[PDB]
Design a protein around this ligand. Structure first.
Ligand SMILES: Nc1ncnc2c1ncn2[C@@H]1O[C@H](COP(=O)(O)CP(=O)(O)OP(=O)(O)O)[C@@H](O)[C@H]1O
Ligand SMILES: Nc1ncnc2c1ncn2[C@@H]1O[C@H](COP(=O)(O)CP(=O)(O)OP(=O)(O)O)[C@@H](O)[C@H]1O
Ligand SMILES: Nc1ncnc2c1ncn2[C@@H]1O[C@H](COP(=O)(O)CP(=O)(O)OP(=O)(O)O)[C@@H](O)[C@H]1O
Ligand SMILES: [Ca+2]
Ligand SMILES: [Ca+2]
Ligand SMILES: [Ca+2]
Ligand SMILES: [Cl-]
Ligand SMILES: [Cl-]
Ligand SMILES: [Cl-]
Lengths: 460, 460, 460
């Protein structure tokens, strides 16, 4: 009797799980919203610098209208290698945000110290990938308490991580110079100091890592193996040649119904072989509406949870009216941000700029009266941005990348408490001019020669 | 000199052969119509129960318009495993019909006894697959004389098996309770009784299998190996890691021209990479016209052959006028049935319900005067049904699944001699009401709360 | 720590390199136009005979409108095997032209003799493939000095080989009978005569190969291995199981920008997963405009280079005006030919026949006054031709095949110095009849019952 080879089956449920971390794929938690969970772990925030510039460049005539295709190709080539490292060292990639990504190693408190060592080593191997484009990487690491929030409605779900380790990992990464691995103070507080040579960082309790210098008889591979005891989903045994246990998921309608809610319809369409796999890679003009919500305490998940849910229910019904799409949600320095987009592929509408502004105002007014929301700020910018599926085959997400994405983000941060917009949006919208106010020019981190900015004042 | 690896070539001819059994693929017989052939073998009729219900359910709002995608996924996952078993135990899968399938082990008369043992074991291993959805399987087995009919015209070909083993395998399967393997009387008559523990079945000469209990020194794997001597196409040698010898077919225009006639144009389009692979998986409203032809002797292939051919030539020219499609042809309890469909993907027409009724009447009137056709009955029902490619990668077919498919089938059987229709077809058609007659409600096996049924009486 | 398997990555840059020889892929030369390079090597011109006939046949009703699909399938099946041989014996496939292909073994002068032996053996193994369709192969081999020309503009590039070895390899192949391997006189002059049994060829200095008869202790495999020392890109080591080193190319924007210019936009679209992979295989009516340019000395690359460039700049701006496309450029017996096509897939325009004629006249008049161009001849024919990607997965090109392609080629050769056209083009064009002159019928190699031919005289 033959024993023929089983071919890898690439079922829809497996294709969907590529878009989600194990935190969600194997999380099996209540379908009630908000849902909050609490655990400990180590975070790695890997930032690529140089891509919003390359993005601008690939618009130029030299790429012969294959700019989006070339950009996605070169981007994925690099990011794939970072994703392999993270996964092979046992991390869960939680989210992609432009050219950056956040990864988690979830463990019991007592194992934090050893895991931090695994993560530091992963970090240094990722720094190593780029001694070989004007691109390099900064890495922030944090460790401690983490909360998960799941929010949404009956057809769509989003998740977020929250808490002091989350805010820290961002702080850490923003202190880094090109090539630094920075540890949060709590990460440095909890780590095995006999292993790692650091240096101080100016007016900063965080630290920079210089070296991983392990004692005479330390064998990384045996240390790693001990560490895998604490890793629920590390591929092993018959499946040790796979990057992710999720590659072995089998059809299961209940599970697929749950997971599909995290993924955009147009992605699902491609997953279902009803749209060419290259239709979603595009350099196309869009409008980013970037919404920031600040709370008195952005680590109190039980407080901010209901608020984010309340805001999400409003934001989604307002966006629905204009094929606006929430592309990502995540904690910023201050607050929870919604990266919303008008004009993704297959979703254009006329008078997009006007609608973006009115939808922004509507969100601003509703969110400003939600209970625990202390301040709403919204940034609106329009231009050519890259849209596409970024990452590795086994772990990837739809993202947007562009100077306008960064500008909308910097506007909501540098002009808090109002709805602001760029010149492009101001000029192309069809609204009375006295609904705007022209603003003072602020010098904004990672932004040059933005034309005039405006506040969208609305009627009076 | 390198000896590089040859990649599996997935030529069109190989993709086409996935839709056909070895009986046709390697049959190389005359292109004249009808063609009849005569042989012996063992048949396995594997029925899944629970799928026309799941089908109804996947229409519900909870599947978020990915009902067809989820249904095909979960269905193929299960049916694939059954197809692997059948093929690995050396069977030829002849046909898929909804959620059921018919398999053949063709052998010389003197080998029937040993083969029946292989098939029983395959059966019990398939029962085993579902101790793990509200779905299970019934299996009927038969053995004896079998006839093949090939019929059609210059562009399309269909085949059918006919004879007492064919009628028996159906009888057997319809006696089964959930999980039974039933043997036909002749199968039980011919089998190695020292191997198998049976039990009697009420007012029935057939039997149920309880156990395969083989003598002290019986080694299944050596027994199987001896059995493969009689299996023409069992993959072996260099190709023992393949499920089907047909995976090694090479381009051959003469052969491809012949095989393509069995497959629907829209499938060929997908095979030719001219249509997305997911366009044919759909939950869509259609009209089933189910045509049953009864003969005085439904095992006399030389008699019924010319008649089925004569009917097919008419039916195809009438359907052609409305993009109606013959989806399958097969012997029922009584007679030869044509499962015809109006509104498959890419094939909708307006006033589909009207046309279905007029085409039915036309077929009824022509077929009723074909020489050896004793009775024509036609069932017409309309609703949401699943359309798609069901089975394994290496062996699959386009099929339809739905409560309306079963209803049209039960109508033609429970209201013989007339053209009948459902409420949906009655209400939506555009014909004078006095062309119909409202019928008595019959209680019909595997059917609840069908609204009123009607006879399509036609003009007078 | 796992070491998971890397999946073959099928990046766009690798898909693009399938369309190009290593000569271009790894050539890294100046982007200035014309560019000329000079080297030595051995050439193999492999011609298939029988395909323009099969092509005509696959138009017939028996193929049920899957003629293009069947033709490409059977063609690639055969041509793939020839491509594997050539690559495994270390050749660089330079170009496909209909059902023929040109291959190069580039080496230092001192290694010509040994390489010629490798190539002869490859040739005889390719002859061997077809003892098994009314198709066989003729092979011409040449050796000596070769020049490369690269020409084009900022968005498109073409290349050509030029010189006496190039003209010879064609002469040689045109002397061959079905199944002969013919060597050019210089090839025979340079080869290891102790190895090969030849015979004379009538009124011809070239020779036919009868046998490869190697001395007592000659071991082909060790001889081959020594020969690979001189082969820059022979896959080896970790990559010895690949047909081409180009399968390992990594994303590199600069390189991709350069390579993409050699490939048609519609191909790039399919490469980018923005068009179904089967859209470019078609039997479709087109118009071939075949342009031949003769120079006093068709081996003087430094002379003919600027001229071909000058002509190309004109030809491309004239074709652009009508979605006309240059499909291939190559040296003929006399001169440089441009195989231009009106009506490729996605590129039809109305009044195609008229435009073909006016574009031909325009090209004729401009090219006739380019400096070193001694004679321009243009052939115009219209009909059903096969369009598609021909070759192996790892090495393939878009080509056209048809009796009309050959006719346009024979017209420009047998009616030099004028623009000629066929009956189809004459009848369907919308021009005054007195712009044409009906010509004497010439008996033309590999052409029967072409209706009347005409000269396109133009206005007076
Ligand atoms: N797709 C995306 N998702 C989430 N945030 C994004 C984003 N694209 C841009 N941003 C926001 O834009 C802000 C500016 O980003 P930075 O991290 O300072 C740019 P960089 O990494 O130095 O170079 P880059 O712009 O080439 O990536 C970030 O704080 C980030 O939150
Ligand atoms: N695609 C298809 N091809 C052929 N016949 C079909 C069909 N779909 C339904 N039928 C017919 O419908 C009739 C009713 O089928 P049954 O076998 O009694 C249903 P079941 O298997 O108990 O549960 P199910 O409806 O979930 O499959 C059958 O006799 C069958 O011939
Ligand atoms: N796609 C293509 N590219 C370049 N030239 C082509 C071509 N198709 C036809 N031709 C030209 O047509 C001419 C006639 O070709 P031959 O080589 O004599 C035909 P053959 O090989 O005997 O049989 P065939 O027509 O079945 O291939 C050739 O000289 C060739 O240059
Ligand atoms: Ca960034
Ligand atoms: Ca069934
Ligand atoms: Ca040829
Ligand atoms: Cl997050
Ligand atoms: Cl059948
Ligand atoms: Cl060339």
């Amino acid at each position: 009797m033959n024993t023929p080879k089983e071919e890898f089956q690439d079922w829809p449920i497996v294709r969907i799980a590529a878009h989600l971390p194990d935190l969600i794929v194997y999380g099996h938690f209540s379908p009630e919203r908000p849902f909050m969970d609490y655990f400990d772990g180590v975070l790695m925030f890997v930032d690529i610098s140089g891509f919003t510039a390359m993005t601008e460049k690939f618009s130029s005539a030299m790429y012969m209208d294959r700019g989006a295709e070339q950009l996605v190709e070169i981007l994925n080539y690099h990011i794939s290698a970072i994703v392999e490292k993270v996964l092979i060292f046992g991390g869960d990639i939680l989210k992609f945000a432009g050219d950056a990504l956040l990864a988690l190693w979830r463990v019991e408190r007592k194992q934090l110290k050893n895991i931090i060592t695994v993560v530091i080593k992963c970090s240094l191997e990722i720094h190593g990938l780029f001694e070989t484009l004007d691109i390099r990487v900064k890495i922030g690491l944090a460790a401690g308490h983490i909360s998960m929030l799941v929010f949404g409605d009956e057809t769509h779900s989003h998740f977020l991580v929250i808490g002091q380790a989350v805010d820290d990992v961002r702080l850490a990464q923003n202190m880094a110079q090109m090539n630094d691995v920075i540890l949060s103070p709590n990460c440095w507080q909890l780590c095995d100091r006999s292993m790692i040579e650091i240096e101080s960082v100016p007016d900063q309790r965080a630290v920079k890592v210089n070296f991983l210098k392990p004692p005479p008889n330390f064998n990384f591979d045996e240390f790693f193996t001990k560490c895998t005891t604490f890793m629920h989903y590390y591929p092993s045994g018959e499946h040790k040649n796979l990057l992710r246990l999720a590659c072995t998921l089998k059809p299961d309608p209940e599970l697929e119904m749950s997971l599909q809610k995290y993924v955009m319809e147009s992605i699902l369409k491609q997953i279902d072989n009803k749209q060419l796999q290259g239709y979603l890679s595009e350099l196309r003009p869009v409008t980013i509406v970037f919404v920031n919500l600040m709370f008195e305490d952005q680590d109190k998940a039980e407080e901010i949870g209901p608020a984010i849910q309340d805001a999400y229910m409003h934001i989604t019904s307002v966006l629905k009216i204009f094929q606006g799409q929430i592309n990502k949600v995540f904690m910023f320095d201050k607050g929870c941000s919604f990266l919303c987009v008008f004009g993704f592929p297959g979703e254009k509408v006329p008078d997009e700029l006007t609608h973006a502004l009115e939808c922004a105002m509507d969100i601003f007014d509703f969110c400003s009266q939600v209970h625990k929301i202390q301040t709403v700020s919204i940034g609106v910018a329009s231009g050519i941005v890259f849209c596409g599926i970024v990452g590795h085959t086994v772990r990837h997400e739809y993202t947007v990348i562009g100077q306008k994405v960064n500008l909308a983000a910097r506007m909501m941060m540098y002009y808090p408490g109002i709805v602001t917009c760029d010149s492009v949006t101001y000029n192309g919208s069809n609204l009375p001019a006295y609904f705007f106010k022209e603003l003072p020019k602020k010098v904004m981190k990672g932004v040059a020669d933005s034309g005039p900015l405006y506040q969208y004042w609305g009627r009076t």
